[PDB]
Amino acid sequence: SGLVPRGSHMTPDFLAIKVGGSLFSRKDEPGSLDDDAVTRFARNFARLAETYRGRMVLISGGGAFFSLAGLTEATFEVKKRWAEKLRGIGVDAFPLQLAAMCTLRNGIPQLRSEVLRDVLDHGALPVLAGDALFDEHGKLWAFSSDRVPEVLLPMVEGRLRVVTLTDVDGIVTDGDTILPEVDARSPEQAYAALWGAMHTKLDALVTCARRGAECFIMRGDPGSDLEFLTAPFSSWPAHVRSTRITT
Amino acid sequence: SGLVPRGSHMTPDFLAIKVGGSLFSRKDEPGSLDDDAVTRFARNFARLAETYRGRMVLISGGGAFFSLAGLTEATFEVKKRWAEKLRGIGVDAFPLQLAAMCTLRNGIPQLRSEVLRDVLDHGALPVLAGDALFDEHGKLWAFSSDRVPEVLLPMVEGRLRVVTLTDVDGIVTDGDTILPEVDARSPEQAYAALWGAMHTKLDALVTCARRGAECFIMRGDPGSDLEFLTAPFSSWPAHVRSTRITT
Ligand SMILES: Nc1ncnc2c1ncn2[C@@H]1O[C@H](COP(=O)(O)OP(=O)(O)OP(=O)(O)O)[C@@H](O)[C@H]1O
Ligand SMILES: Nc1ncnc2c1ncn2[C@@H]1O[C@H](COP(=O)(O)OP(=O)(O)OP(=O)(O)O)[C@@H](O)[C@H]1O
Ligand SMILES: [Mg+2]
Ligand SMILES: [Mg+2]
């Protein structure tokens, strides 16, 4: 309910990192992950998981969509692949089926967060992903991985940082240039820049920013060190590109 | 809270069918299902699912066990295999990760049943299995597939029938003979007959019977027609063997 100190000079209290499916899945084989990419990412996420032990979730994109029962199985498989890889390197990773613990009411996800808190409360790493969710009149919908950070909003106290890793440096305006900053209260310019994919990321991150989260769209790379994600924005290395979305 | 009419001449209101892993998994390859067996069972379960649409759960045994994060993935895979097969023949089957929707409090599972009811409420078939569950002090335990019917007890109104299909005709007393009936209020003779596997089934089914369920241990066979499971016990075909556990 209360006043949370926020700013570019403050350390985040919780990290939700979303890795886009385009970064670890082969076009050259649809349905197929690139094990090298998953392995190298996993190593960089493990470092973050150890610093943010009990204060981080990993959200995977990817996994091919009542025929949406298939979707829940496809996204479970992706969670399993990340969780397995992470555990192979010493990280206590537990995959959770969002469909079993979250429904939609008037379009807003309602997480029954007891298990998620349990995994966190005792210092493990929840591995999440998009899913098929039921709503209040009992219908099933496809809920994108990009929107999964929204589920954390009621639960996370303090400063939530959401990072969505994708295959572009940020929101580009045309093209010549990226938008370094978006005010979630008036994000017209950002929507106007889009050519849906990036639209879904933007809606999701504006929603989270309205509830106080510091959000980023930036480029992921399996090899890239991500430790700066634990640090105040003001202390980030020079020449990191991102679109930062805050209120 | 109220008086439920029960008896050998009454039709069940809800079916929980548990299929033992020994019935559809190869010894000759551990971790490996027998697709023929799953296919033929699925056909017999589909018939029941259509009659008990919205009034049945399928519980799978099988799937090899913080290293119990592996267990939740192993049992998810088994659920997926059943769900996929069932959907291939017209049944609206949705697999649910028990670990995401159920914790232990003082050893008793506490199901957050909203999603399970949603899958049921709108006439689909939940596919369940054993799992790793967290408890109230946040520890993870292996929760056998045999105990999964216990999770339904608070939720199911009316007459619950639990059927556990295994590789024996019932509880054999030595050996020459099976116990056709066990009174759950005084099941000494049944425990005394056991030589744990069958012990876990018996504890689980005595617990459910104490809460009014009509429970059975009987032999499963991929080919066997199971329609009599929709019918009052008194009308079952002659020479069906089972151990029936009631209060
Ligand atoms: N203004 C814009 N700036 C940057 N990208 C944009 C813009 N408008 C549209 N896009 C598109 O959005 C894409 C990024 O979103 P996309 O949904 O394709 O990938 P991803 O979500 O990271 O991976 P996944 O969808 O597999 O989880 C870019 O590759 C780009 O083609
Ligand atoms: N009195 C008894 N009557 C019958 N079976 C008994 C008795 N005592 C012990 N058992 C053993 O219990 C076994 C059945 O339980 P078991 O756990 O092995 O299989 P299942 O549970 O159906 O398959 P899964 O364990 O793969 O889910 C029998 O095969 C038998 O060896
Ligand atoms: Mg996308
Ligand atoms: Mg057993």
UniProtKB/TrEMBL annotation, chains A, B:
An annotated Gene Ontology molecular function: isopentenyl phosphate kinase activity
Q: Which residues bind ADP 1?
A: 18, 22, 166-167, 172, 193, 201
Listed binding positions for ADP 2 are 22, 27, 166-167, 172, 193, 195, 201
Q: Which CDD domains does the record associate with it? A: AAK_FomA-like (cd04241)
Record field: transmembrane: none
Q: Report any Pfam family annotated for this entry.
A: AA_kinase
What residues correspond to the site Transition state stabilizer?
27
Residues given in the record as ATP binding sites: 18-22, 63, 167, 197, 201
Q: Which residues bind substrate?
A: 62, 145
- Positions binding ATP 2 in this chain are 18, 22, 27, 166-167, 172, 201
**Recorded family membership:** Belongs to the isopentenyl phosphate kinase family.
Spell out the protein name for this chain.
Isopentenyl phosphate kinase
Organism, per UniProt? Streptomyces wedmorensis
Report the gene name.
Answer: fomA
